[PDB]
Design a protein around this ligand. Structure first.
Ligand code: HEM
Ligand code: HEM
Ligand code: S85
Ligand code: S85
Ligand code: S85
Ligand code: H4B
Ligand code: H4B
Ligand code: ZN
Lengths: 403, 404
């Protein structure tokens, strides 16, 4: 049996047959659905994931079952048989990274999946070197406001030894300073990484938008501190197209969303440092990062400037302030010529992606709770679209924090 | 930690474990290999175990579990089943079961109110005309001149070898949907089919955007029959906006009483195929889904044009700004008309209080995140940041096939 998938706005029906290729088990059983949880709770098998991945690569280039195809499967068998592991060709790595993005059920930006610059950094042997590669990535990805998707791939995990790791969850993060009295100055999401930085010797500031240094770690070594050169870190002050006092709030955000704590798995190999970046969807900044209660939490302050009736929920002051904040983000990014996409444009392009994927592959793994944006859900088309969530490889996965 | 689902609140950092899911006898649509949580829709000795189960639940609820009364009720149930193949619920069993079915409904955000539910027994009903008197009575009590009270009326259970009692309409109040020559719809496109059924059974149609439909009511093994609700029983609220003076000119309105009439109520294996129940609205149901879905009244562009927004580019957020104002108009006009309504901020806050009560009372609460989170301003409400475990418990409200 294959899932019947319905869109309730159009009345149309598809069948997901792609999920039959699912590698791994998710959190759900017939007795209870755990879909809304954010986090999850040797050689024969590395070999089979390797074979499987190599079969996909050769299929992708239509040279499947050919000479090169069997010689490569032989290489993999011969390398695993004597070292217990193997290595990807650079073009196999490029294919894997793009497929890992393609497969990410929670990503709304997947229409872009084929366009991704891949920097091979597997020849790194120190924290210093990683920092070199990280500066290259940021300078490349930012491209003065004209953002380009990219991923840098540091050396794979190895049975012996500790992992290459970037300790920060993103390459650009604002410090969060826990005050005497429990309040937080800056981004509350970053209190622990901020504390790690200081303790590994960083001199802190006391702003709300102090860009953190990076903690980079080469195997079985103490991590090292590196400051990003400020001219590499593009930022957009926030203002509103009609509310003149908004700029006064002194709010801002960085251009480049570069996730750096996830693990990339391709054909059994695991890449524990492989930072990747695209461009922001404006609700991530306008709704979540600035309005979440446990993040910068600015709703009430804006509502008061707007001079709204804060005393009651039913004046919808929250809803109103949130819309002006998102509009400020969009306006400000467009003004500064920095790539951003609104939640309506993004979800329309994601619907076109579902359709492309339906033809290309027979389905598309999608996580409905993550795909529908955090404001105006049912005003976007994805809300009315049933989706099927499941795990395909290559994949991005969570991994434990290295400390 | 323990061997049950760990549940996290990401805003507050707190953790619970759901042990209630262990009580689930019925499976849902998910498996280890894929999640189907976002899909809208996924006996003999068999009756006996559902019955025995429900009777145990009843005796626990009255703290008389294991008692001689408890064991005599079980034998009473097996006696009756054994000789007729079915059995009857005591009155208090039916009240308990109705409340528990609402308590159990994973998609309902209003469950903080579950113990406060007025249950009309109409298990004696025996004609379509009589079902109509009960329904009028329900609408009268439940509306209460604007001060809405939750209620369910329960009609006779399925019975082996006799047809069912059915209310054909999906709600007791529904606006007509008239299919046009040009292929569009006047009124509510959700009601096209029921509207066409009503006409085919002899209703003379209107041609307004808000024509109240008649009810089609079917007694056992009979063609359904048509009943027009007297207009003074159907309370309606004209929509205006607190500051946008022109909003009233749009002539939009909504009824006071949300009453669902097509779900099956299942209690200890018995099936109440007609058991309409009503509460009060949460404002986003009307202001966001009913008035702004593309496939419903679809008014967002009309309202944004009147507000003079730039509807030619997504990035002006015209949709979000118009939806906010339509929601504000629904809240303001209900308040003004003194008709009970609840906004999505108050409703979700209260539902978090419900989760905390149920966590202490039963060790968890089955809940369907995609339906509990409201269709605007999702992450500005606390439910967005609450993980939720979804499973089926009984007594239950269930979907059932349409009778035609
Ligand atoms: C091109 C512009 C892109 C946009 C607008 C975009 C949008 C998003 C958004 C909004 C999320 C949810 C983020 C959150 O709520 O925390 C997300 C998740 C994700 N995206 Fe993207 N994305 C883009 C590019 C990329 C790229 C280049 C990759 C990797 C090569 C990627 C992989 C992911 C993954 C793995 C997730 C899931 C994160 C998790 O499980 O926590 N995306 N995307
Ligand atoms: C008292 C005020 C109540 C409020 C505010 C309320 C709120 C809601 C909302 C917003 C929904 C989701 C509707 C949708 O978008 O389709 C819903 C679903 C539901 N509520 Fe309520 N509810 C209330 C009372 C009741 C009562 C009195 C019952 C039954 C005794 C009930 C049983 C249900 C059920 C069974 C569902 C979902 C069934 C489904 O669509 O699959 N609720 N509730
Ligand atoms: C709190 N969520 C988990 C943190 N995390 C590991 C994360 C992962 C992502 F893929 C994406 C994001 C959001 C950042 C992002 C990343 C990318 C590549 C594009 C984009 N528009 N936004 C966070
Ligand atoms: C409100 N509905 C009835 C209350 N109730 C559970 C009950 C009533 C009886 F008269 C007798 C019994 C005992 C079982 C039994 C036995 C027989 C022969 C018939 C019948 N209707 N019921 C239960
Ligand atoms: C896909 N399902 C839509 C139709 N349907 C069967 C339905 C069922 C409900 F319980 C509730 C609703 C929503 C109406 C409602 C019903 C009640 C009792 C209270 C309230 N605020 N709102 C619809
Ligand atoms: C508990 C809940 O699943 C959690 O808050 C999720 C919901 N959906 C989300 N969707 C996106 N895009 N990002 C998120 O962080 C979350 N958070
Ligand atoms: C496809 C998707 O599951 C469907 O549109 C759901 C989503 N969430 C919902 N939530 C509520 N309260 N009501 C609904 O009708 C829906 N529809
Ligand atoms: Zn599931």
């Amino acid at each position: 049996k294959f899932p019947r998938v319905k869109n309730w706005e159009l009345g149309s029906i598809t069948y997901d047959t792609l999920c039959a290729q699912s590698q791994q088990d998710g959190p759900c059983t017939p007795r209870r659905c755990l879909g809304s949880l954010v986090l999850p709770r040797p050689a024969e098998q590395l070999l089979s994931q390797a074979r499987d991945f190599i079969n996909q690569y050769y299929s992708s280039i239509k040279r499947s079952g050919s000479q090169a195809h069997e010689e490569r499967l032989q290489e993999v068998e011969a390398e695993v048989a004597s070292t217990g592991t193997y290595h990807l060709r650079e073009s196999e790595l490029v294919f894997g990274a793009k497929q890992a993005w393609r497969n990410a059920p929670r990503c709304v930006g997947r229409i872009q999946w084929g366009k991704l610059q891949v920097f091979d950094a597997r020849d790194c042997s120190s924290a210093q070197e990683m920092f070199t590669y990280i500066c290259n990535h940021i300078k490349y990805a930012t491209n003065r406001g004209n953002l380009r998707s990219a991923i840098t791939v540091f050396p794979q995990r190895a049975p012996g030894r500790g992992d290459f790791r970037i300790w920060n969850s993103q390459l650009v993060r604002y410090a969060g300073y826990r005050q005497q009295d429990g309040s937080v100055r800056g981004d509350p999401a970053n209190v622990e990484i901020t504390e790690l930085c200081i303790q590994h010797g960083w001199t802190p500031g006391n702003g709300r938008f102090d860009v953190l240094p990076l903690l980079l770690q080469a195997p079985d070594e103490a991590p090292e501190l590196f400051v990003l050169p400020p001219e590499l870190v593009l930022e957009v002050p926030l203002e509103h197209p009609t509310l003149e006092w908004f700029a006064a709030l002194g709010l801002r955000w960085y251009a480049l969303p570069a996730v750096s704590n996830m693990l990339l798995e391709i054909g059994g190999l695991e890449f524990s440092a492989a930072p990747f970046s695209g461009w922001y969807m404006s609700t991530e900044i306008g709704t979540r990062n600035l309005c979440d209660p446990h993040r910068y939490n600015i709703l009430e302050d804006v509502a008061v400037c707007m001079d709204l009736d804060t005393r009651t929920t039913s004046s919808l002051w929250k809803d109103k302030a949130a819309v002006e904040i998102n509009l400020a983000v969009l306006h400000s990014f467009q003004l500064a010529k920095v790539t951003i996409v609104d939640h309506h444009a993004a979800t329309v392009s994601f619907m076109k992606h579902l359709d492309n994927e339906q033809k290309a592959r027979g389905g598309c793994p999608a996580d409905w709770a993550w795909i529908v944006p955090p404001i105006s859900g049912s005003l976007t088309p994805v809300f009315h679209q049933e989706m099927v969530n499941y795990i395909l490889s290559p994949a991005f996965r969570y991994q434990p924090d290295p400390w």
